[PDB]
RNA sequence: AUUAGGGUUCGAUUCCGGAGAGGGAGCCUGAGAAAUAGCUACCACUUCUACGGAGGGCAGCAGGCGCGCAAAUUGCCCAAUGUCAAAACAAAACGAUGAGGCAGCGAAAAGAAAUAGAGCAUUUCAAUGGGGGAUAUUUAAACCCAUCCAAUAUCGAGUAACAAUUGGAGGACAAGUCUGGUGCCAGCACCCGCGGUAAUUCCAGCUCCAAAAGCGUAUAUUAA
């Protein structure tokens, strides 16, 4: 116990994308002596602070690869204008990770069997 | 199908499977550098042969021929890095004389033993897989890691190891 | 002696087409005459049915009775005398057993001391024959 | 004619292997082989090396 | 692929080009088809029927029989790459996509590398991942890899039973003038040759040898 596990952050290639209303950057987590992996929830709360972003959720963060043999990881992150441009511009899978879902429709097959039986039918029976 | 990912051979088995002259020369190297298998010898025979062979081709060539300068200096650089050769030697003829030990001396297993962090070479080979040796801040688990001569200062031990 | 000249490349190309046919390791590769007669029909292995168990008196100064089998190839319907490779292993073979047959290893000719026997059995009823001899698997009763 | 089959292999008595300790594996053995031959063995010259011998 | 060089050989198979949709032929629609998950016919096969009839075309992906020496799941998904389209996304309101991707099966090949290290009796000072598991990371979701055994607070190896095999030991060819058993028998042996009563070659035990998570054998091919 030299101290608590200490986790800092550096973003690398930073880009302001005004087309989608987001900022684009590559995130690097410097964490030594963090048992396990740094779960995302913490990276977000750090980034939201370091840029002084007014909300936590405006920061969406996806994909991470640790480094072989020591605590450091690398990943991508986005930062948006407020509540809107997460909802519009983000995939449905990266949304559900935040908790905002659109629940998965019935298993893809089940749609296919119905599509076909309807290739039989005419009028209002279909 | 449709997956384009290139793979290749690193080694070759010798003709004349068993010659008591070669087998002798083999074991004398296996025990000295702490090697697991003959396979790891035949490997530095091929990376040495390929290297050697392009040295001939470029050497048969006329001086100042554009390949001999550009492609010739690059083989002659990378052997100064990795320290296959001494920075005193630049003729490109020297590349054409190298030996299996030169590339084995440069293998992280021997160097951790030569640098003196280990008893001989068997401690060194286990002590690498045991994840304790780091090259520069980077834990390196592969005994066959070839140690660039700029990196022979930095080895020491890991910071996740017992030793830090 | 041979002919030499800048413009002579017909004579040289023709003269080789003619003189390669005199070659035998390939007067073999170029004759269907080889393929029709190799009862495997070109394939490295084949499956037969065991027709008959056969002793074959060994050749020349060697005295022995080598343990051979007749075989009915399932591809070709051809018949083949094949060799059972090791001690007592003829006990692992019964009549009408399916048997995988391989060559002896000099491609189309018999391995010395069995007169005219070019093939040996590698498997009996989908179980390996050497793996039965050396005791590993038990021959499935069917 | 065919009943001599399998004579000798069955007729030879069985020793049922023998228990022994395990050897080293990997490079460990490669060291065990190297200690024998290139260490601890000095030769009277006399150039010869016998890997097996037998108590004749 | 193999090759000093010159060559010898393979190229059904990912990319380009050609051709076909069981066999043949004919044609409509359309900018483009002699299209086959489009039509018409005949041939060979075949599936329902209430006997009047009506159907089918896996050399699409899974899978079945058959055949053969010989080859995986009737699996998830459009997250990515493209395509078509009347089409951005989101907001009651997420187009299809067996193209494609992901995993399952997978010792065809290819890379890395465990099966111990430290000071023959012993004795004991550590270290490790196989494996267990995770606040989690991964991913469309799950996997696998990587990170982790406290960060206030969580696993563990000593006969390392967590136990390396496949072929050899007369010659070519590296390694036994060991000990049993057999007696031209059984078998080995690519070739040469072993076995007919002391077998350096068979069958065994021990011993050593080569290669090693790989190693024999068969056929084809290149060098020789």
XYZ file of C-alpha atoms (C1' of nucleotides) in Angstrom:
712
model
C 0.000 0.000 0.000
C 2.155 2.828 -1.219
C -1.083 4.806 -1.477
C -4.524 4.410 -2.954
C -4.722 3.307 -6.547
C -4.056 6.444 -8.574
C -5.573 6.876 -12.026
C -4.866 9.822 -14.313
C -5.827 10.601 -17.904
C -4.274 12.093 -21.048
C -6.124 12.552 -24.326
C -4.077 12.387 -27.450
C -5.417 13.277 -30.884
C -8.074 15.865 -30.193
C -10.582 16.932 -32.806
C -13.572 19.255 -32.715
C -16.253 17.788 -34.919
C -18.887 20.418 -35.509
C -20.778 18.269 -37.965
C -21.924 15.875 -35.260
C -21.629 18.272 -32.319
C -18.907 16.299 -30.584
C -15.270 16.380 -29.627
C -13.082 13.471 -30.666
C -9.968 12.283 -28.868
C -7.969 9.215 -27.942
C -7.883 8.551 -24.198
C -4.918 7.158 -22.266
C -5.261 5.973 -18.671
C -1.974 6.000 -16.794
C -3.100 4.009 -13.777
C -0.419 2.256 -11.673
C -1.260 -0.300 -8.971
C -4.934 -0.402 -9.823
C -5.989 -3.953 -9.038
C -7.773 -5.255 -12.125
C -8.942 -2.926 -14.893
C -10.180 0.625 -14.508
C -13.898 0.346 -15.265
C -15.220 3.045 -17.558
C -17.392 4.787 -14.963
C -14.263 6.283 -13.454
C -12.605 7.378 -16.701
C -15.763 9.279 -17.554
C -15.953 11.098 -14.246
C -12.339 12.116 -14.722
C -12.739 13.398 -18.285
C -15.970 15.221 -17.495
C -13.875 17.038 -14.913
C -10.644 17.612 -16.832
C -12.449 19.488 -19.598
C -15.057 20.765 -17.109
C -17.912 19.114 -18.949
C -21.205 19.975 -17.225
C -22.632 16.458 -17.365
C -21.223 12.978 -16.942
C -23.217 11.354 -19.688
C -22.188 13.828 -22.381
C -18.954 11.869 -22.273
C -19.389 8.586 -24.094
C -16.402 6.268 -24.043
C -15.985 3.061 -26.025
C -13.400 0.354 -26.608
C -10.258 -0.141 -24.555
C -7.142 -2.147 -24.780
C -4.893 -2.405 -21.807
C -1.173 -2.568 -22.310
C 0.677 -5.835 -21.899
C 2.157 -6.102 -18.466
C 1.421 -2.892 -16.653
C -1.435 -0.673 -15.829
C -1.963 1.620 -18.752
C -4.933 1.408 -21.109
C -5.994 3.258 -24.232
C -9.404 4.080 -25.644
C -11.586 6.527 -27.497
C -14.009 9.081 -26.155
C -16.501 11.640 -27.383
C -17.975 14.735 -25.741
C -21.197 16.322 -26.898
C -23.476 19.279 -26.610
C -25.829 18.568 -23.926
C -28.561 15.936 -23.820
C -29.419 15.875 -27.490
C -26.353 14.842 -29.366
C -25.781 11.736 -27.365
C -29.307 10.624 -28.148
C -29.120 11.425 -31.832
C -25.615 10.590 -32.821
C -24.633 7.559 -30.903
C -25.135 3.921 -31.891
C -27.765 1.973 -30.137
C -25.219 -0.378 -28.627
C -23.116 2.417 -27.164
C -26.338 3.876 -25.866
C -27.548 0.812 -23.996
C -24.176 0.783 -22.274
C -25.122 4.176 -20.854
C -28.521 2.751 -19.991
C -30.392 4.388 -22.888
C -31.704 1.497 -24.885
C -33.968 0.672 -27.672
C -34.797 -2.906 -26.685
C -33.751 -5.556 -29.172
C -36.630 -6.653 -31.398
C -37.513 -10.373 -31.585
C -34.672 -12.675 -32.566
C -33.862 -11.992 -36.185
C -35.065 -15.386 -37.418
C -38.554 -14.874 -36.080
C -38.918 -11.822 -38.321
C -37.786 -13.880 -41.305
C -40.318 -16.675 -40.922
C -43.058 -14.065 -40.803
C -41.730 -12.210 -43.849
C -42.085 -15.384 -45.871
C -45.554 -16.506 -44.808
C -46.625 -13.037 -45.885
C -45.108 -13.568 -49.327
C -48.037 -15.947 -49.637
C -50.879 -13.643 -48.727
C -52.930 -10.984 -50.536
C -55.122 -8.189 -49.194
C -55.930 -7.686 -45.527
C -55.063 -11.210 -44.402
C -51.375 -10.337 -44.627
C -11.604 -17.286 -47.461
C -11.097 -13.651 -48.288
C -8.896 -13.275 -45.211
C -5.578 -11.776 -46.276
C -3.162 -12.182 -43.416
C 0.342 -13.099 -44.431
C 2.329 -15.770 -42.609
C 5.732 -17.206 -43.191
C 8.446 -19.586 -41.974
C 11.183 -18.466 -39.625
C 13.306 -21.636 -39.674
C 14.528 -24.646 -41.616
C 15.699 -28.146 -40.773
C 19.186 -29.001 -42.066
C 19.977 -31.574 -44.668
C 21.907 -34.550 -43.415
C 19.851 -34.931 -40.246
C 22.650 -36.094 -37.952
C 26.301 -35.291 -38.403
C 28.310 -35.758 -35.255
C 30.171 -32.562 -36.136
C 27.008 -30.480 -36.259
C 25.187 -32.148 -33.383
C 28.251 -31.514 -31.250
C 28.200 -27.898 -32.363
C 24.499 -27.817 -31.608
C 24.655 -29.054 -28.006
C 27.633 -26.869 -27.237
C 25.353 -23.922 -28.080
C 22.211 -25.213 -26.427
C 23.853 -25.607 -23.047
C 25.821 -22.392 -23.310
C 22.935 -20.065 -24.194
C 20.329 -22.041 -22.312
C 18.210 -22.971 -25.288
C 15.041 -25.034 -25.216
C 15.291 -26.777 -28.556
C 17.341 -27.030 -31.726
C 14.547 -25.074 -33.359
C 15.852 -21.898 -31.785
C 19.242 -22.500 -33.372
C 17.938 -23.170 -36.880
C 16.106 -19.876 -36.585
C 19.218 -17.750 -36.194
C 20.664 -19.740 -39.041
C 17.924 -18.482 -41.327
C 17.736 -14.892 -40.124
C 21.485 -14.936 -40.522
C 21.367 -16.569 -43.932
C 18.757 -14.160 -45.324
C 20.749 -11.248 -43.940
C 23.992 -12.713 -45.253
C 22.537 -13.437 -48.687
C 21.367 -9.918 -49.418
C 24.818 -8.803 -48.370
C 26.253 -10.880 -51.207
C 23.816 -9.616 -53.809
C 24.414 -5.990 -52.887
C 28.109 -6.727 -52.718
C 28.347 -8.328 -56.164
C 26.877 -5.035 -57.326
C 28.844 -1.946 -58.431
C 29.640 0.667 -55.837
C 27.332 3.706 -55.740
C 24.631 1.674 -57.440
C 21.469 3.131 -55.905
C 20.521 -0.131 -54.224
C 23.961 -0.569 -52.728
C 23.778 2.820 -51.025
C 20.206 2.822 -49.767
C 19.498 -0.862 -49.277
C 23.110 -1.475 -48.327
C 23.253 1.117 -45.586
C 20.053 -0.181 -44.057
C 21.369 -3.673 -43.452
C 24.506 -2.017 -42.213
C 22.578 0.194 -39.817
C 20.344 -2.424 -38.261
C 23.363 -4.512 -37.401
C 24.844 -1.616 -35.467
C 21.599 -1.356 -33.626
C 21.052 -4.753 -32.076
C 24.841 -4.793 -31.903
C 25.358 -7.724 -34.202
C 28.379 -5.686 -35.289
C 30.589 -3.104 -33.684
C 30.141 0.543 -34.568
C 33.795 0.436 -35.579
C 33.021 -1.883 -38.496
C 31.422 -0.474 -41.611
C 32.502 -2.109 -44.826
C 29.345 -4.113 -45.612
C 31.863 -6.942 -46.046
C 31.588 -7.523 -42.326
C 27.908 -8.359 -42.546
C 29.050 -11.140 -44.810
C 30.982 -12.622 -41.903
C 28.775 -13.179 -38.869
C 28.192 -16.176 -36.727
C 25.321 -17.805 -34.866
C 26.747 -16.629 -31.511
C 26.600 -12.971 -32.506
C 22.821 -13.120 -32.735
C 22.578 -15.361 -29.683
C 24.700 -13.082 -27.535
C 22.140 -10.406 -28.281
C 19.148 -12.437 -27.146
C 17.548 -11.107 -23.965
C 18.131 -14.424 -22.219
C 21.910 -14.238 -22.368
C 22.004 -10.524 -21.710
C 20.007 -10.719 -18.492
C 22.538 -13.346 -17.468
C 25.435 -11.291 -18.801
C 24.090 -8.092 -17.258
C 24.315 -10.111 -14.074
C 20.730 -10.299 -12.871
C 20.870 -14.091 -12.882
C 23.006 -17.166 -12.146
C 23.758 -18.386 -15.663
C 21.122 -18.640 -18.345
C 18.536 -20.979 -16.937
C 17.675 -18.601 -14.145
C 17.538 -15.897 -16.781
C 15.158 -17.780 -19.036
C 12.800 -18.656 -16.238
C 13.177 -15.224 -14.678
C 11.921 -13.699 -17.933
C 8.818 -15.862 -18.219
C 8.265 -15.290 -14.533
C 7.500 -11.809 -15.815
C 10.033 -10.016 -13.574
C 12.416 -8.575 -16.164
C 11.293 -5.441 -17.974
C 13.294 -3.903 -20.800
C 12.501 -0.282 -20.378
C 9.443 0.054 -18.157
C 8.014 -2.637 -20.471
C 7.698 -6.136 -19.079
C 9.022 -8.513 -21.728
C 8.209 -12.176 -21.335
C 9.909 -13.554 -24.463
C 13.387 -15.058 -24.009
C 14.130 -14.474 -27.672
C 13.627 -10.726 -27.487
C 16.597 -9.269 -29.299
C 17.949 -6.389 -27.260
C 18.674 -3.233 -29.208
C 22.025 -1.862 -28.056
C 20.416 1.414 -27.026
C 18.183 -0.614 -24.732
C 20.857 -2.568 -22.902
C 21.085 0.139 -20.259
C 17.471 0.014 -19.192
C 16.633 -3.573 -18.223
C 16.604 -3.788 -14.391
C 13.378 -5.398 -13.027
C 9.644 -4.929 -13.234
C 7.671 -2.521 -11.095
C 4.909 -5.073 -10.683
C 7.496 -7.661 -9.734
C 8.485 -8.532 -6.182
C 11.485 -6.397 -6.906
C 9.721 -3.035 -7.149
C 27.708 -33.535 -79.886
C 24.736 -31.271 -80.421
C 23.668 -28.404 -82.646
C 24.399 -24.829 -81.821
C 23.252 -21.527 -83.254
C 21.226 -18.446 -82.549
C 18.297 -19.493 -84.709
C 18.454 -23.199 -83.878
C 15.901 -23.229 -81.079
C 13.473 -25.492 -82.953
C 15.981 -28.286 -83.233
C 16.768 -28.001 -79.548
C 13.174 -27.825 -78.363
C 12.154 -30.692 -80.615
C 15.183 -32.802 -79.754
C 14.254 -32.729 -76.080
C 10.594 -33.575 -76.583
C 11.802 -36.647 -78.392
C 14.462 -37.716 -75.926
C 12.539 -37.304 -72.713
C 10.294 -40.200 -73.644
C 13.350 -42.398 -73.265
C 13.204 -41.549 -69.596
C 11.475 -43.992 -67.241
C 10.731 -42.128 -63.974
C 8.204 -40.207 -66.008
C 7.705 -42.415 -69.018
C 5.730 -43.273 -65.931
C 4.218 -39.876 -65.171
C 3.039 -39.535 -68.755
C 1.411 -42.838 -69.410
C -2.194 -43.415 -68.418
C -0.669 -46.840 -68.696
C 0.521 -46.230 -65.155
C -2.801 -45.050 -63.691
C -5.076 -47.757 -65.065
C -2.807 -50.381 -63.528
C -2.231 -48.963 -60.055
C -5.231 -50.577 -58.401
C -5.500 -47.549 -56.149
C -5.934 -45.588 -59.354
C -3.553 -42.923 -58.197
C -4.749 -42.459 -54.609
C -2.435 -42.907 -51.656
C -4.692 -45.328 -49.757
C -7.714 -47.508 -50.440
C -10.327 -49.522 -48.551
C -10.850 -53.172 -49.264
C -12.792 -56.124 -48.008
C -10.770 -59.098 -46.795
C -11.441 -62.100 -49.002
C -8.884 -64.602 -47.806
C -5.966 -65.104 -45.446
C -2.823 -66.176 -47.248
C 0.649 -67.306 -46.383
C 3.293 -66.346 -48.911
C 6.526 -68.260 -48.869
C 9.287 -65.727 -48.632
C 11.704 -65.187 -51.466
C 15.213 -66.386 -52.110
C 17.527 -67.301 -49.249
C 15.035 -66.128 -46.725
C 12.696 -68.750 -45.376
C 9.501 -67.463 -43.789
C 5.788 -67.466 -44.383
C 4.659 -63.867 -44.590
C 1.180 -63.029 -43.434
C -0.778 -61.621 -46.336
C -4.437 -61.097 -47.183
C -6.444 -60.871 -50.368
C -8.420 -57.661 -50.664
C -11.414 -56.519 -52.717
C -11.054 -52.797 -53.334
C -14.293 -50.899 -52.875
C -13.496 -48.310 -55.523
C -12.306 -50.450 -58.369
C -13.489 -53.970 -57.451
C -9.861 -55.005 -58.148
C -8.123 -57.708 -56.112
C -4.855 -57.191 -54.255
C -2.573 -59.263 -52.084
C -1.521 -57.071 -49.180
C 0.821 -57.660 -46.286
C -0.089 -57.657 -42.617
C 2.712 -55.651 -41.035
C 3.613 -57.189 -37.708
C 3.566 -59.932 -35.061
C 0.481 -62.064 -34.963
C -1.537 -59.152 -36.314
C -3.259 -61.519 -38.687
C -5.269 -62.340 -35.564
C -6.777 -58.879 -35.683
C -8.110 -59.570 -39.154
C -11.113 -61.736 -39.973
C -12.658 -62.384 -43.341
C -15.052 -59.783 -44.745
C -13.544 -57.050 -42.544
C -13.106 -53.633 -44.040
C -9.432 -52.845 -44.297
C -7.542 -49.711 -45.300
C -4.628 -50.536 -47.570
C -1.477 -48.545 -48.256
C 1.576 -49.000 -50.390
C 4.802 -50.514 -49.179
C 6.808 -47.448 -49.983
C 8.654 -48.304 -53.132
C 5.916 -46.791 -55.170
C 4.692 -49.543 -57.459
C 6.982 -52.424 -56.606
C 7.338 -55.035 -53.934
C 9.475 -54.615 -50.838
C 12.131 -57.267 -50.862
C 11.430 -60.792 -49.642
C 7.686 -60.848 -50.180
C 7.308 -61.973 -53.794
C 5.142 -59.483 -55.633
C 3.466 -57.784 -52.664
C 3.150 -54.031 -53.005
C 0.682 -53.097 -50.299
C 0.318 -53.244 -46.533
C -2.686 -52.874 -44.226
C -2.830 -49.797 -42.019
C -6.295 -50.149 -40.428
C -8.823 -52.849 -39.638
C -12.489 -51.872 -39.366
C -11.594 -48.170 -38.941
C -9.223 -48.986 -36.062
C -5.515 -48.718 -36.758
C -3.622 -51.972 -37.109
C -0.418 -50.909 -35.434
C -2.541 -49.299 -32.739
C -4.101 -52.693 -32.130
C -0.786 -54.564 -32.214
C 0.871 -52.175 -29.849
C -1.954 -52.281 -27.399
C -3.868 -49.002 -27.440
C -7.393 -49.586 -28.709
C -9.610 -52.636 -28.618
C -10.929 -53.927 -31.920
C -14.624 -53.002 -32.008
C -16.864 -56.050 -31.955
C -19.670 -55.636 -34.460
C 0.593 -73.002 -42.654
C -0.935 -69.990 -40.918
C -1.035 -71.321 -37.361
C 2.570 -70.498 -36.476
C 1.330 -66.895 -36.385
C 2.293 -64.893 -33.341
C 4.575 -67.570 -31.923
C 7.443 -65.575 -30.482
C 5.784 -62.383 -29.241
C 3.522 -64.339 -26.900
C 6.162 -66.873 -25.920
C 8.530 -64.276 -24.512
C 8.023 -63.645 -20.779
C 6.814 -60.243 -19.606
C 8.728 -57.791 -17.429
C 5.888 -55.208 -17.134
C 8.123 -52.096 -17.517
C 9.733 -50.644 -14.385
C 8.873 -47.718 -12.103
C 11.272 -44.807 -12.403
C 11.312 -41.104 -11.498
C 10.342 -38.515 -14.090
C 13.006 -36.661 -16.043
C 13.280 -32.935 -16.686
C 11.514 -31.607 -19.757
C 12.004 -28.659 -22.017
C 15.354 -26.954 -21.849
C 15.823 -28.501 -18.423
C 16.693 -31.820 -20.006
C 18.694 -29.971 -22.648
C 20.811 -28.951 -19.679
C 20.853 -32.454 -18.241
C 22.246 -33.644 -21.582
C 24.813 -30.859 -21.681
C 26.171 -31.387 -18.189
C 26.903 -35.037 -18.924
C 28.833 -34.577 -22.149
C 30.585 -31.199 -22.126
C 31.089 -30.874 -18.363
C 32.405 -33.250 -15.691
C 33.852 -35.403 -18.473
C 37.494 -34.793 -19.222
C 39.039 -37.335 -21.579
C 42.479 -38.866 -21.741
C 43.523 -38.011 -25.402
C 42.810 -40.704 -26.406
C 40.201 -39.281 -28.762
C 37.060 -41.340 -28.215
C 33.627 -40.862 -26.663
C 31.327 -43.683 -25.649
C 27.755 -42.632 -24.999
C 26.590 -46.106 -24.079
C 28.787 -48.683 -22.537
C 27.926 -52.069 -21.190
C 29.216 -54.145 -18.282
C 30.570 -56.835 -20.629
C 6.618 -25.020 -54.068
C 11.480 -25.759 -54.993
C 15.730 -23.771 -56.733
C 23.829 -21.163 -56.550
C 22.562 -20.113 -61.697
C 19.801 -22.106 -65.552
C 15.575 -24.575 -64.705
C 11.357 -28.509 -63.058
C 6.654 -28.367 -61.306
C 1.749 -26.702 -59.362
C -2.163 -22.919 -60.029
C -10.513 -26.282 -58.703
C -9.430 -22.163 -54.467
C -9.797 -15.313 -51.932
C -8.134 -10.627 -56.875
C -9.083 -9.804 -62.277
C -11.184 -12.409 -66.905
C -14.407 -16.392 -68.948
C -18.589 -20.140 -68.328
C -22.709 -22.678 -66.011
C -27.333 -23.296 -62.705
C -29.762 -31.348 -63.549
C -29.693 -32.096 -69.186
C -30.597 -29.434 -73.914
C -33.359 -25.660 -76.498
C -36.904 -21.174 -76.856
C -38.269 -16.496 -75.111
C -40.699 -12.327 -72.477
C -39.642 -7.893 -69.608
C -35.777 -4.310 -69.525
C -30.834 0.471 -70.351
C -28.746 -4.253 -69.856
C -30.733 -11.569 -69.678
C -30.738 -15.969 -74.327
C -31.661 -14.663 -66.638
C -33.037 -20.113 -64.185
C -34.509 -18.571 -55.663
C -38.016 -15.438 -64.300
C -41.443 -17.830 -67.892
C -42.542 -22.075 -72.088
C -41.409 -27.206 -73.755
C -39.234 -31.951 -74.075
C -35.798 -35.766 -71.596
C -34.045 -38.105 -66.997
C -35.455 -38.004 -61.896
C -39.012 -36.712 -58.285
C -43.511 -34.249 -54.333
C -48.410 -33.631 -52.848
C -54.115 -35.267 -54.532
C -60.552 -36.086 -52.464
C -58.067 -39.446 -59.241
C -60.169 -34.097 -61.453
C -55.362 -32.125 -60.925
C -51.317 -29.066 -58.944
C -45.980 -28.952 -58.254
C -39.725 -29.201 -57.894
C -34.173 -27.554 -59.469
C -28.676 -26.008 -52.923
C -22.417 -25.561 -58.438
C -26.437 -19.494 -52.222
C -25.373 -20.543 -46.268
C -26.273 -24.306 -42.568
C -27.602 -29.627 -42.835
C -29.086 -34.851 -44.985
C -28.019 -39.338 -48.167
C -24.449 -41.142 -51.537
C -19.600 -41.467 -52.865
C -14.886 -41.809 -51.504
C -8.101 -42.226 -48.864
C -10.407 -37.232 -48.015
C -13.190 -31.926 -45.602
C -16.974 -28.132 -39.743
C -22.876 -25.548 -36.944
C -29.786 -27.189 -39.645
C -25.196 -21.568 -34.534
C -25.539 -15.513 -33.362
C -25.617 -10.577 -35.950
C -26.132 -6.659 -39.330
C -21.837 -3.772 -34.644
C -18.165 -3.253 -38.974
C -17.174 -3.610 -44.819
C -20.344 -2.990 -49.296
C -24.755 -3.214 -52.109
C -29.816 -2.066 -53.630
C -33.415 1.882 -52.131
C -38.807 5.999 -52.398
C -33.551 5.844 -47.863
C -29.621 10.243 -42.321
C -30.208 10.289 -37.316
C -33.311 10.854 -33.668
C -38.125 11.757 -31.988
C -44.579 7.011 -30.616
C -41.095 5.737 -35.689
C -33.642 1.282 -35.057
C -35.474 -1.152 -44.141
C -33.669 -6.233 -46.117
C -28.925 -8.160 -46.388
C -26.531 -16.955 -44.742
C -23.053 -10.818 -49.326
C -20.203 -9.813 -44.996
C -18.830 -10.153 -39.947
C -18.630 -13.092 -34.945
C -18.122 -17.480 -32.352
C -18.561 -23.405 -32.615
C -15.894 -27.517 -35.003
C -10.589 -27.427 -36.814
C -2.381 -30.807 -34.796
C -3.637 -28.605 -43.312
C 0.128 -24.953 -42.789
C 2.532 -20.483 -39.966
C 4.539 -17.379 -34.955
C 5.622 -17.011 -29.943
C 6.803 -20.898 -25.598
C 5.574 -23.940 -20.400
C 6.691 -28.883 -18.186
C 11.112 -25.803 -13.157
C 14.788 -21.818 -10.898
C 18.459 -20.584 -6.497
C 22.374 -22.217 -2.408
C 23.848 -38.090 -5.138
C 22.816 -38.050 -0.301
C 19.287 -34.369 1.665
C 17.228 -30.024 3.632
C 14.575 -25.509 2.559
C 14.325 -19.833 0.590
C 11.844 -17.778 -3.026
C 8.991 -17.443 -8.182
C 5.391 -18.653 -11.506
C 0.712 -19.776 -14.922
C -2.084 -24.341 -15.988
C -6.361 -23.631 -13.325
C -10.147 -20.612 -9.928
C -12.305 -15.850 -9.930
C -13.353 -10.382 -10.461
C -15.397 -3.528 -9.358
C -14.472 -5.159 -14.257
C -12.263 -4.923 -19.516
C -13.803 -7.158 -24.199
C -17.789 -7.506 -27.704
C -23.779 -5.834 -31.192
C -24.224 -9.788 -27.049
C -21.204 -13.519 -25.582
C -16.246 -15.196 -26.411
C -10.742 -15.100 -26.624
C -6.450 -11.782 -25.395
C -4.773 -8.268 -22.201
C -5.154 -6.294 -16.502
C -5.771 -8.245 -11.791
C -4.897 -11.480 -6.392
C -5.673 -5.462 -2.632
C -6.990 -0.076 -3.283
C -9.894 -0.180 3.255
C -11.042 -5.471 2.153
C -10.408 -11.868 -2.211
C -7.445 -18.175 -4.707
C -3.774 -21.549 -4.967
C 1.524 -26.146 -7.364
C 6.110 -30.363 -4.511
C 7.016 -37.439 -5.889
C 5.893 -29.702 -9.805
C 0.364 -37.132 -9.167
C -0.213 -30.119 -12.585
C 3.873 -37.175 -14.037
C 6.060 -35.702 -22.991
C 5.518 -38.242 -26.691
C 6.883 -40.515 -31.470
C 10.495 -43.334 -33.924
C 15.427 -45.643 -33.486
C 20.477 -48.178 -31.240
C 24.878 -53.789 -37.547
C 25.736 -50.270 -42.168
C 24.187 -45.853 -45.021
C 22.824 -42.716 -39.991
C 23.638 -40.167 -33.931
C 23.039 -44.074 -30.430
C 24.824 -51.286 -26.765
C 30.536 -56.634 -29.109
C 24.086 -55.366 -21.880
C 20.424 -59.112 -19.975
C 16.407 -62.357 -20.890
C 13.043 -65.360 -24.853
C 12.980 -67.576 -29.832
C 15.720 -71.283 -33.014
C 15.712 -69.872 -41.301
C 10.272 -70.494 -36.400
C 7.680 -65.981 -35.466
C 8.932 -61.596 -37.170
C 12.452 -57.202 -38.732
C 14.460 -55.082 -43.194
C 12.915 -48.470 -47.918
C 18.352 -50.875 -49.914
C 22.318 -54.131 -48.087
C 20.997 -57.891 -45.440
C 19.390 -60.313 -39.999
C 16.831 -65.226 -37.532
C 18.916 -72.630 -38.977
C 21.001 -72.788 -30.117
C 26.175 -68.236 -27.229
C 21.021 -63.033 -32.667
C 25.231 -55.765 -32.123
C 19.138 -56.342 -36.595
C 13.201 -60.238 -34.489
C 10.076 -60.306 -29.260
C 11.052 -58.035 -24.463
C 13.642 -55.311 -19.919
C 17.289 -51.795 -18.864
C 20.466 -48.291 -21.199
C 21.656 -44.321 -24.547
C 20.263 -41.503 -29.398
C 17.420 -37.768 -32.709
C 13.507 -34.541 -33.014
C 10.194 -32.585 -29.555
C 4.038 -30.201 -28.559
C 5.202 -32.538 -31.726
C 6.581 -37.508 -34.373
C 6.204 -41.908 -37.683
C 3.923 -44.115 -42.234
C 1.389 -43.879 -47.845
C 1.100 -41.474 -52.460
C 2.123 -37.189 -55.409
C 5.892 -33.397 -56.467
C 10.898 -30.241 -56.182
C 16.211 -30.575 -54.891
C 19.463 -34.756 -54.548
